[PDB]
Amino acid sequence: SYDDEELEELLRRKAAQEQKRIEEERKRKAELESQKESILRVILTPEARQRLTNIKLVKPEFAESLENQLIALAQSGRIKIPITDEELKQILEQISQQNRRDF
Ligand code: NA
């Protein structure tokens, strides 16, 4: 009927669904981020992992993309493991130079 009582409890159903949706998003990101850090501990040297942790503080979206890509590169076996801070700096300089030529 969409009388007042139905609108009230449909909108309550929406608040409950948004809360659940957002609680589930917060939980999934925390657990997946935990497992990505467990991979980064083994695939990066301590100094390289420290640099990526620092990048995540200042450029979180960039850092999340870079984590996913380093994890894929390591799984692929194409690159020697662990990735050193020197090697991570070369990857970052390559990204920087590739985006200057596309600026
Ligand atoms: Na290193």
For the chain, the domains span 4-100
CA 40 / ligand 1 centre spacing (Å): 13
Experimental technique used? X-ray
Crossing angle for the helix pair 4-43 and 60-76, nearest 10 degrees? Answer: 50
CA 92 / ligand 1 centre spacing (Å): 14
- Tell me the C-alpha distance between 103 and 90, whole Å: 20
CA 25 / ligand 1 centre spacing (Å): 34
Q: What is the CATH number of domain 4-100?
A: 1.10.8.140
Tokens coding 16: 């409950």
CA 51 / ligand 1 centre spacing (Å): 10
CA 91 / ligand 1 centre spacing (Å): 14
Closest Cα to residue 52, out of 78, 27, 76, 83?
83
Decide if 84 contacts 45 (C-beta within 8 A): yes
- Tell me the C-alpha distance between 69 and 73, whole Å: 6
CA 94 / ligand 1 centre spacing (Å): 18
Please give the C-alpha separations between residue 74 and each of 9, 38, 39, 46, in angstroms, as whole numbers: 50, 13, 9, 16
- Tell me the C-alpha distance between 75 and 4, whole Å: 56
Point out which residues pair with 83 in neighbouring strands. 44
- Tell me the C-alpha distance between 52 and 42, whole Å: 14
**Ordered alpha helix ranges (H), the chain:** 4-43, 46-58, 60-76, 85-100
CA atoms within 13 A on the CB side of 71: 16
- State this model's resolution in angstroms: 1.5
* Residue 102 dihedral angles phi and psi, to the nearest 5°: -105, 0
